[PDB]
Amino acid sequence: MNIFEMLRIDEGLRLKIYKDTEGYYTIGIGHLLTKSPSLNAAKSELDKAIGRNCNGVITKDEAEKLFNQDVDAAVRGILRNAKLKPVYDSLDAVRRCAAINMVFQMGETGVAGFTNSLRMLQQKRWDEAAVNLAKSRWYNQTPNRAKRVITTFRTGTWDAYKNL
């Protein structure tokens, strides 16, 4: 398992514009297009992102290119953030994937506010971190995905993903 496989499981792959769990226009492997309720605005964002007139549909290659960019952006967001970088650098490789997954889903500023969990992770208090992480809108709104990511932080293994 690696971060691409993990997020491909969590986000799926859809080649036509769809609405994500929050009702926002998205495409590909969880590439958010816009939070605007306008499908036309989403199509404009899509065309800008891909560099051609897509009329709301892309190829698998194009989806994977956006996904490479989005993973890259999540990692860079972590490395540029003074609250996230030290915790990330303290983690092992599997747990770094759980970190990237959260930043991919919620964005860097969002995650950077998880202050108590960040501290417990930096301290390697894994069961405590897991308990704290579940006390969140995130866990309540996407509990199956949150449980996988939390298990990944708790154990430092891919046990929650290997069956998938």
Ligand SMILES: CCCc1ccccc1
């Ligand atoms: C709950 C914070 C998880 C995290 C995210 C980004 C970098 C390190 C740890």
